[model samples]
Target chain A: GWHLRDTTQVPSTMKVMILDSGDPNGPLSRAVRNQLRLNGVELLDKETTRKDVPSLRLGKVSIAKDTASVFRNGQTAEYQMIMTVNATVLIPGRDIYPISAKVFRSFFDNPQMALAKDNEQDMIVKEMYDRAAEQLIRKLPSIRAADIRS
Target chain B: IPNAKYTTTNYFEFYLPYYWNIAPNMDATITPHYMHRRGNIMWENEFRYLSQAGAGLMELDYLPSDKVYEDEHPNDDSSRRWLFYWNHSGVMDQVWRFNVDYTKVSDPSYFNDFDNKYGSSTDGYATQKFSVGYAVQNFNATVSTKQFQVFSEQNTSSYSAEPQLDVNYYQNDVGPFDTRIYGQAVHFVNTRDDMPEATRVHLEPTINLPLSNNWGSINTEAKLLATHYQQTNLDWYNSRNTTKLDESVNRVMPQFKVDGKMVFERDMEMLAPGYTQTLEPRAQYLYVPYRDQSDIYNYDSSLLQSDYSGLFRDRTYGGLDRIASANQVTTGVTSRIYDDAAVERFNISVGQIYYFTESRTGDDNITWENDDKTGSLVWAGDTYWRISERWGLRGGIQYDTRLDNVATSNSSIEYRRDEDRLVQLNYRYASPEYIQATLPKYYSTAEQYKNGISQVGAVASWPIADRWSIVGAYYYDTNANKQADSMLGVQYSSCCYAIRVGYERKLNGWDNDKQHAVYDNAIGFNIELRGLSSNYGLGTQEMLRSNILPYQNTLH
Candidate 1:
């Protein structure tokens, strides 16, 4: 049987942005992003030196978290997490349907606007990126041609 | 140009042996008389200016059948016996002929495609001519019918009589006057079957005159056509083979025209410095109130042979209405370029006709009530340019326009090397939707269709050698809009036989939408044996020998 199908897919990376209106990134910037330094606590770090420390340093960040909206309650403040993930997908040479480009929006609620402990923003931001990754994997099968040339 | 050069006339008479020789004792005879013609322009081959020349012809003949012979057997031969059976012979004869040719013409106004001063167009005439003949000892009578159609139909029947008389006179030279006065009256019944059967009669008389020695001559022909016709719905069908049902039409077209010509040069070199140039002004006026009667008759619309009966608009040839009578005037000049080696002259003529009456009313559907007030002006030129002894180029253009309306023109260019190669390109253009008005109507699988406007066509023929030749042609009309139709074929001919195979590809616009492409591809073959025994020279076995008896033969 012969049939016709239309799809477009490319081996390319796309930047996914999940914006959160809050002030959480202000406190975690130093501990998570800057990372002044860390003592390898015992035997595991005994072999390290200045060169090793420089080599072990973080190069670039894959995700970013931003706070766009915030509210102050009587005892605590709430904030939103705006997460951006740089995701990549591997496409097979054969598929029935090609992948399409689409944008997804999600919301998050945090009880504390700047607290590092019990961070409400991390829970939702991580879940959203996970959902997007799963969706990307599921759509890959439909993006491929059914019989490939053979 | 004097096409009247090199005239050769042929006259012949043949007889038939009847099934039952009636009144044999009285020497009754059956005569199947015939006259044939073969004429060509002298120096036509030398005429390098005309790409194509012609030898034209016309044949008049009468052949009676067995029915006429059986009916004419005299009741009593003792009654006024003479050289032949004494009168009362009902001659049922059918007249038939085959005349096909191409002629080269010219134009001079020098506008549009005709700016070249010469062009060529082909005129066609074909029809079945047959009638009944009745002869008395002292008088003669005949009745016959004929039909021809182009954009319209021409149905005509005639009845004529002969008053046998021996009159002779010869006159010496008179200044510019060589006179021969003769009279003939033929009652004609003609009908344009496209309309109702309205017959007309014509009385034509001719006078031959020679104006002068230098001025070639003029012949005046005057005719008066009277009319009377009625129509009745009479359709009878027969189950038995003996009851043969046929269709007949009666038409009355009383038409008269006078044609006169004068040649100022007598084969002199002075008149034609470089080329033989002649100015012959002609005028003709006909008054036919109901000329395009096909609108009234409206018969045989389905039986018409040409799908191109209608053009989107009016053309140089004019519509069918011109068949009625219209006041017309034609003025033109002609030139002949002669080539000594070819022994023929190329004829170039440019002319235009001014019609006082309109041929069509531009109505949605034509009708008799339409006024003939529309006058049209047409200019035409044609020439056959003989490039060499074996090569020729024929090109011409014709333009017809109304002062305030759109203009239409047809032009073509053709190159020919007799029996060697032929290439022709033709094109037609209309200022408006003129082609839509004259398109032929035909029924197709999906719908009824008509020929479109604006056409381009090319034909090529090549002979590889003495026994093999090939021909191919292509035609395209934009009226199909986005559709395209193309065809190509080849043919091979031998000494006395030929086989032709051709393939055609026609695009169906309606079907193309559903499929990526839709085309009708077909191949055909045709074989022809040049000369059959019957057509060559063959007679019945009984007619070879004659009896030696002094008077006649008697078989018991």
Candidate 2:
């Protein structure tokens, strides 16, 4: 049996860190931080002493079929995107619990204005990111219960 | 309306929005629009609230009076113009839920002539609907009423559902096979004078057999569709109908489908340490006997546009109009390499459908087959190798195998150093004549020019200095051999305030029937106070992203 070495990684001030790997300080990172903060989850400083207090590592978030689109045919008529990410939850006196989540959303886009700046997609995608963050938070209940149970 | 503070231009109209969070989960916005040409202000107000039980929003747009061009024309019908919309949704007792969405426009041409450049205005009806439903333990039911608002300029509206009942039930482990029942009963109405209304009742029951493991899986489905129709008027139907039919008809169709896929994965240490490569090969065999559906009037049935996933759809269409007889097999495969960190570095997908018979035809004489086999070949591929954590590349193509033609293709390379700094160069081509179903000999003629698209362009939104930024787009249609769309914008953004100036020239439409092609040129300008509640980046950034941003997120 191994003995515990670090207690800093196990403290949950109800805090989390978003990996710079996925674009820290980027649009998506900023969006995620806002949603998390709004939902009572504080952002842990990347420069903080502990590196693993259930840190979230955001992965590829893509809007499929939205590339170089023209008005006529194929899947470009609407945009579909999915966000997938990995989370490392540190449970005291237990092995590290790793989890993942996948969320998808879609919206209609008028290809007739494909060459023009409609600006609607930005807000829609923004709302989508917000909803995705909410859903990912919903996936943390089991982990939260485990931490409290201990 | 998340992160929707700034919006694109409506040349003569300037919008300045003020948002207030009246409570913890409630907010209201009052946007004052100063019309330069009209010398007046138009008002728009939106209010929304979200509770644990439900949520809803109401948006109202009112203009004090119609505008007068002064010299161009007199102010006719100087009445108040308005657009009203409210959408609400809620849940009760965990099993009961309801939604209400309705919209009314004072000017029928409000949407067509002047586009709603703001946010959350339904295009194409988003279908005005109100419904309540219940769901519990594998059974679900909903009763709803909906309609279609017909618009001008190349418009043919479908029938509406004045009221409809839909139910779904799924039972697993039923006599060695999982069984499911899908049923719908709707009262239909029409918008045009030529078409008459009809009531349709459809019931589909299916049984599935599944066998699977970690390496692969196989599933088989057998279903029967039984539909009954009652037509209110059959004289117009018989006069122009493709075949002689009864006033009331009953049609039944049986379908069988089997899909199987196997996944093969290996550790790719040679390529990259701790990387895993997966090869997924899938195939589907579908059978549906041909049935003449000429007597059936389409209600909510229309064509569906699909990509690689299009190959395995259970039906050729989305609604209950015409179900294409499918005696064919769909074959496809996908591959991806993922790192141990659960990041997929790259993805590639390709697929095709091979028809076994010529029975694949639908109403309105729309045939998907170009050759006896393969309607279209689809391949979606993307990769990421960031030389500076800012650059990316991607390519996609749809090839019509039997006809030996390229239906559509797209390729792009982009650089995004930051949210405020980016440049994307892209090329696009679509054989509208064939992709949208047009016959030969007139491929590259005026018909294609009026409809087809072939373009090469560049889009950029980059910082000119610490506080100044410029965004622009230039697209040239190779077929028309001219500049299709060009726009340029410059802005100065500070911590407390921002102002933007822009110019755009658009080739709105092509000449058709009796009219010549149309074009419009507009100058755009706006001001936003960051202290007044706004987010980073302006509407032009969105425009730049829409026109050329490659959305393929790849980890290199």
Candidate 3:
């Protein structure tokens, strides 16, 4: 009786397209686009429109702040990158829903290995964007569609 | 990096760029570039900052020249040549917005001499402006000064707004009618020392009756434009003005228009579930009393390029220098097909304008009334179709019925398996003569105006094998019978890093004698750490932007 029990089955895949917010090669668009190949979501092929497919439009991804402050030891500083993301999901024959969230990342900053630190800062920024995409993916299934008319 | 050579200039230069962070709110990038041909080293530094309500950038490039320039100025004492640029934009919590952009250089040909991707080779001028705006409830006001920084040797003076203020008030609904008031005051000056100057004040108020539902809309609007001009320094003998001169002027015009649109839909259950189609048609009629605007100087005005959406505009020109008399109607229709997923699968739009009165107020007249010609007929149409999951097609054409010729045409076909893997074939054609007449750019020479833009190009970015990919682009100018630009690249990628090698040939902006085209050839190399950057930089960014068609995955 103490053993784990499973009562849910895998949901059918939902095909969707993520529209480019600005230039297609922009980081935020790429991050959301490439990360949407999750377990229950499938990216529709280019130009293929099926009634079963939904579309996602990402609003402008804005960085509220990317700053650094010194720690107790003046030799060390902490950097934080804060971003806000907004998106709207449009399901065929169903109503639309807007999703918005904020994501942040922080790391220790210092002058030691300056080049490496700068490189790691970029890496951390990319990871932050990926986290924003993952949050949207994890929340989509719980929302109600409300309507079935286009 | 390999040396690239073109007429009068050579790119035997190397750039070493480094970035540093000084503080939480400030950073800087310093690049020291050495040009072997010029025998000079340029120190390029850009300082950047971020504030709670604003951000700004300051860039300065300085070089001590060892060789003299080829221009007529030989006795110049200073060996220093430099460029300065500053830009800023910000918005406050109180809804106040501010912006500034200024660029200056020591020589007129600096951009052409440098000819890099930062400045699109064809650039010949820069816009200098500083502005502040405020928004409150249903009102917005802005004060700004705008002018152009000359870069071409022709030295023809252009008009500038030394200081301009604009005020706007708008309300969505006031007793079932939308209302708006537009106001502007500008002090105009010519760049040339002896030209005319004027203070122009304009006011316009409009009211609209908007009736609509989910299917379509019907709108009726009326507006009046009243302007006053105070002219000074009008030395008519030396000025560019040829029209009858006036020291003081007042002009007024009134316009009314009615627009209607309707949408019809049909379900196609046989194709798939939720499939549907729509037919949308629109018509608009405009009437404006004629006004003698010949006394107005030709400042900041030009004939507008017209597309399907522009056919219904009341004025033929963009600026307020002249307003064409309008008694015309525009008719258009658009058809669309949606897939079972409610995505646009195919769409097409075609439109045309019918004139009841000839527009004879501007530089050239558009006659379409009772006479030798019944109508000056012109029409334009565009279409897009998703042929299959992997293929797409697009086309557009503008035709002049009186001349029985096509003014412009464009077409493209694409095959895409994924975002990073696609191939596209494109063709474009435009009439130089037509462009020069309708929307002219200042061409340097008569020879350059002979060849209209006619080009055939192809672009591809595809993976060939494991951890290997290829990108290529080629554009041939059919009219000039020359290779315009071409590039090819290969990349080896892994989980941690990537290496890219590419070769490119691009046409520079101008030659020593101001010729239009000069070809430059060069090779580039790039090594990247995937964990450090997301850009595929080693010259691929420039190649992608300048050489390839943008990729897309949207329904429209």
Candidate 4:
């Protein structure tokens, strides 16, 4: 009863590629490529990309952080980091299927630690990007083809 | 815009919720809650399925054992705790429909310990009901069962209807009159051996004559009710003796009512330019002659409180066990003031019921005078005023002129500029006598019976600075001389994320002893990532809408 017998499966020949709007060497593009390979879809070479074939177009990327948890006397204890990615699947002649995902995580950030290890801050940002990318893949099916046509 | 997927003022309170899309028509959500105070883990899961024929939901909450809590009460059986609920509905083609709702809990104190909002706070009883129905246009039939699970030791277990059936039919135009026929059969079983089981059957046939015109409308209704009961060792009463036992009992009564209302309107150009005012006057006369229902036990029927609207009811008691003898006239009037834009700016209504004859049988518990020589003379009034585009006020009062006492009163002042900024201040009062008569048997007390219940509460949410919002609520019980619940939260929302920190305090009664109240305080915080999931919070948005003073930002 739990299993879906008629699950829609995308064929391996369905070529899709991520359009780089910003940070071509960033973790967002890398993660999207990895997820596309896992879903059994072929990736198009950006240098030889074609407009007629279906592809994924990246729209907006936003990041923000705030004081999540604070200690007494108004000192920041942990910071909450959030990232959002908005993209659309361009199906050539069909309507666009928009997909959006967001991810948030909290990490302890004392003033002392901030001063001692600046590299660790970059590591946290990269990890958040990867996690947000994974969530975007999981929510892809939420954007159904029927909804787009309707 | 990114909105926090899930948010709660009560923070850390860690719970991991996961959802599974098992199939196109099936889904499940499982949550694991790690309670910090008790050092225990609880599991909650809900599974739902839907198809063309039926839909069902099954939910379970389980805590295998509470080692920390059990150690505190070594003498008690504190091994396991759980609650289960199942709801199902189905349609077999066009003629048949089925429904079932079954709920069970391991102990009465389960909700008190776990702090679940869905569970009942008072350790009364949980009910399980099932029904199968058939319907076609104006005709309907159903069979069902109503059972209970009594958990508290102080309360006696109640009876359950093992099986019950009902049939109803309606004819809209039966030779210039609308008519209805209804019938029911029920069998009641007691959980305790000392109580006896009983069976009851009832039938009702009614006819209505409805006439209306542009200025007014008059409606007349007549109905006849007949009931039969079969019992063993059932207590009965006569005019002289109260302890007589009857194996078979029967009762029948006829009821009639006539209701009329008129609407009048006129221009109020003097009060305000292009304004209009309206007046509505309504009256109802109900008659149900006296009947000897002494042999029938008060199973589900009880005397209903006389509210402003209840004056129009044909029967004072609910259910077929007892129908109050009534000969009364209910009269009421309402007036409204509208602005130039045809928007209602103010409205007020008052109503009263005058009894022509005294009710023969009544509940001894309510000491209030309902059967006086001059009649009930119960009066109630309510009013609402839109002071301005953003400010509104409402108030109500119920007074028993015959008894020369006020029964209940309430007032609220609200300010709302938009959906996101608002504040409300409210007050409620109930007479001591009212509380004593309304509280359940096991929960009523002399102290509460004397002081009654009065509370003043205020809730507000407003922007303190750019991107910063403040929301808070404070409720105080004047009779109890203590604060009931209070919360103060501060939140900051950026374009993509938001964070909140707040302090909350809750007052609750002890499960072991209902007489004493306890306080629990906690400070928590939340981190929200927008564009993901909508967070369920503890009255977060409602607090803002009901508490803070209204302010309209012209820029928006």
Candidate 5:
């Protein structure tokens, strides 16, 4: 597992977890993606994820949401903007138990004017980036410790 | 940069006036002015027979000048061989304006500089042009006579006059959606020399529409003109003047343009954020059909020099200096920060055009083609900010794609307040070739050639006391790169008179010495002595004509 130095530094390689909100062609999501590319930020084509379930599992980390309408919304996937990560220190060569990071996000309706500023789509993507990074830093290391203790 | 030599010239005019003012709507004034241009200096003075006498709205002026006679065979040295003119203007109603004028000059400046192959012809222009216009609502009608008479062994004359009507119609919202339309038209006549004259007419129309709330608006406009034009200086027109008569031309130009703008915006206030953003994309397309008026004429500035009309009314100035007869398609986008007043803005617009004829269409094209491509990009904006309560800064930049290799740019910083003081510094740099055709060239006495580009100037003024202030300006060239003209003058004023004094140095780039700058100095005192009483004169109509001066050419 690798880590970013700070919120502003560009990581050599970074993963953006896109929560599928049924429509992949919406302006909100599409504009954000295109704007990021214009800003010199590249997106990974294939993002790794867990199976559709109430509880999301990433190596040693687990995020559980107890709700009857969690994964299904009229055939639409319920999604949020958040991140979780579990860590495993690589000791030379032996296989380790597990270490991972997972992110999720939930959007609140933003005012149209706030969204119309020049290059504003990039600002939204950047916000998503920070939220996910914070989640990983907080949840992954603790989850790894708990698994090692067990 | 080379040192420029200086020279000076001056004109002193003497005036004798015959005045009468005592009736209700009548009064009169007559005076003639003598103009002189020696070396690099020139000015006009009072002449006999020119006068002004009137009161309130009514006024009259019968000022006239005999044409300048040839050194060999001169015309009537007094009033008989001179030009007689009358001009009138008055208010008929709130939206209606009435104007009428008539002029006649025997010795016009026709053949004087026509033979000077390469020089700015400020000489040999002594003629008369009659013009009149009436305005009512959005419509106006005008009539005028233009005559160019050359005094020589063989009488050489070019005369034309046209009765014109123009109307501008504007409207909004006419259908299920929304639409706007604008239209205008002008009727004219083409006549000159020995060639047969023809009547010409021109019309223009424009429309705009907004399709969607999110999408921007669109605009389209077009023009069509038909006329018969006679070329100048044919052997048949004048046996002595052996210039090509085939130069006469009959030209027609029809063109259209369509432009679109797309605007998008959003704000952060409702989204729990604290900012706003906006984006705009724009594009325009134009097309022009070709016309070869080779049989009609060469666009000449002679009419303007003869005082027939200002540059704005001249067809040659409009077609050659301002508009282009070429096809072009341009697309670009601008993104800006909405709230921050002092922040930087970004814009990128690239455009290209194709011309049917090889010769250039406009002054802009002259540089565009010489640079090797028909494509161009203009990216520039304003930067304004307040540093304090009393001072501020304003400046901007312009970039031409082709001249990045050379340099085509200008910038200025201005500081001022509403009433007290103003100070500014402006600078511009254009290449040598551009300079030559622009300000350095002496050609057809048009506005473009007279008022050339490629110079930097600065002005400053401080009005601390009433009617008492100091004003001065300095202008310099970047290539040949020397001080072109510098004026340091002060003016003191009271109820009706003013006294002025100034020292100046000017360069004679178009004269004998390429590097010789003219040194000129002057100190002058002026007075208004007496004015008309409240109840006399020919009214405002005649007063307006008496106020006309050659030095003040443009309408504004």
Candidate 6:
């Protein structure tokens, strides 16, 4: 049987890195790194040579969108937004654990709002990623334990 | 344990599923769904276990309360809604085995609105069965229960077997012949207010003699069947009057069949390698005296589709309710062309049944009863050709030569490259009123008769570009001038994840007056991330298997 430890002693030697195409300043990478540090997981510098400690590597996330336009009365009636995100988590011995989330939302076109800075497509991606990350974080504990169970 | 999933359908939106792998042989999945239409939440739990002796699955779905469902369906008074299912199968040592599959829904519309996994057709009823059996060598005994959940608005009722017992014995060397004895007892009760109830006890003993050699074989079978029925109020097929009657039915029949085949081989350098051709001629004779079964109820008996292979069948009906009177002989011949590796490349068969007596109990529309000038015979032909390794064609036709009409015809051409890449074009047609004889009078209306039932469909799945593929199917009814079902799906796959989006338009007929059809337009999308696997949620593979036609070359 595999079990999870409830002890509060967070390991300080843990190393976390964001493998996001060398763009550590990206919003997703920075958010993930900040969250990891908040949880007391140590962060490794870009030039650090510490390879013995337990490490967590987060891969760059990718988003895909599918949209369908409904024609009612010979005009664009409604738009269907189907978005998906794929995030990969890699550890030393356990390897890649890919997690994905998809969101479906439909609405009529807001041309004026879309022309504004707060674009619907941009907001859709941000929400999709936020939900994907939240889902990954919720399952992180059990997922690590299941690696040993199998 | 790959954690959770989110699924959504129209009207009732999001559902979250959680997976827990308790042990190597045990697991559980829990799901809670939020119904946007009802502003309530429903929950479902499924647990599975496997051991050295057996395996079992238990599932429960509960909707504590539904305001919209209840308010919209005021006649269905239950405020709560749920469905429960349990399936278990196990072995007790070497001589005993048992299995049970029980399913119950709060109402018949529960499946139609929430789930279609059991059956997509709304016209059919759900069933629950349980059975236990003991077998050792050549003898077996079993007891089981069979029941159904009928739809709400239909004027149909199903008979439930509270407890049915069956016993059988097989003897291989009974004085140079094989024999079998079977006995069954069933207590059948009506599940609705418009039907009768009865208990039936039946016994059948049969003797068979089979001889085979290099050239041909002969098989002969003789059997005696007896049934005793105890009944409550029942109605005749043509009468509205209710009557209660107890009756005993008995029948004795003998059947004989012989088949012979000859092989011819030739070296075909132009074809492939060596080639072998075979011609097989088969004949059968059956003598079943006319039995007066007008007083019996046709519980589970119906006419079967007539095909070339159906000429050899011994019985015309499905269940024991009617044992058709048969004084007929069936004759057929088949020829096949096989390659050097014993792979069949081409084959064709033609068969027909000639009756000595006119069929009085069969379908009156197309049977011998409608044709007085022509003799009592029905003909059918079928053919299959494999032009190449990846191309094939097959078709069949059942014709009533007496009426100078083709009752039914179907054909399909297939091109296969692999499981995920294939194309099929098919067509089907039935003569006017061919299917009406089996349907009720109300269903056989002028509108239905005018159409005559004809359809053409095409299904294909192929890759369009790198990391992208498309699958689609379309079916159109030529007579009704409508599309039955059509779907188009596009998928993109990479090394780590895959996403699919599909749009479907389907039509369904409700079991109501006129059986009018309703159309549904829906779109589905799913994403699969590698290394994240869970048994709790439905996957893309399951969706494809259920929604799309089979592309597997072996079976299709």
Top candidate by DockQ: 2
Show pairs that collide, candidate 2.
Answer: none
Winner by lDDT between candidate 5 and candidate 2: 2
DockQ of 5: 0.01
* Per-residue lDDT of model 6, residues B256-375, tens digit only: 433333333344456556565556678888777666666666554455445676677676655466677777788888776656554456889998888877554432333321554325
Whole-model lDDT for model 6 versus the true structure? 0.57
Question: Quick one: how many clashes does candidate 3 have?
Answer: 3
Q: Could you give candidate 1's per-residue lDDT for residues B4-55 as a string of tens digits?
A: 1111111121212222233423222232222122111111111111111212
Cα lDDT listed for each candidate: 0.29, 0.58, 0.62, 0.61, 0.34, 0.57
Q: lDDT by residue for model 2 over B1-556, one digit each (tens)?
A: 1112222223366567889999987999998866654556668888898986588998888877655433333655455657777778776654676788677666534543343442212233333678888865467788987764443234444466778888888686576577889998987776665676788899999998876454666879999999998887667767885575566978899989999977676778776787656677899999998887876765655444334555666765555756787887888887765565534445677877777675453454643445444343433322333334567666666566543467656666778877667777767666654544532232234442336667777777778666788878886667656665577778888878778676665444444564444444656566666766656664455545332222333222
TM-score of each: 0.37, 0.72, 0.75, 0.70, 0.47, 0.70
Ranking by lDDT: 3, 4, 2, 6, 5, 1
Error of 1 at A16 (Å): 99
Q: lDDT, candidate 4, residue B225?
A: 86
Mind giving the per-residue lDDT tens digits that candidate 4 earns over B465-499? 65677777776767667676577878777656777
Candidate closest to the true structure, highest TM-score:
3
Q: In candidate 3, which residue ranges exceed 4 Å CA deviation?
A: A1-58, A61-150, B1-8, B66-74, B115-117, B237-242, B269-274, B362-376, B402-404, B439-445, B464-466, B510-516, B533-542, B546-556
lDDT of 4 at B406: 84
**What's the TM-score of candidate 6 when only chain A is evaluated?**
0.59
Stretches of model 1 off by over 4 angstroms after superposition = A1-150, B1-213, B233-279, B285-325, B341-345, B355-376, B403-409, B418-420, B428-451, B461-471, B478-502, B506-519, B524-556
lDDT at B216, model 2? 65
Q: What is the lDDT of residue A121 in candidate 6?
A: 40
| CAPRI accuracy category, model 4 | incorrect
So what's the TM-score on candidate 4? 0.70
Query: In angstroms, how far off is A67's CA in candidate 3?
Result: 36
Q: What TM-score does chain B alone reach in each candidate, compared with the true chain B?
A: 0.44, 0.81, 0.89, 0.86, 0.55, 0.86
Can you write out model 2's per-residue Cα lDDT over A25-52, one digit (the tens) per residue?
A: 3335545664564343556655777644
Each candidate's iRMS in angstroms? Answer: 52.5, 13.7, 23.4, 27.5, 31.8, 27.9
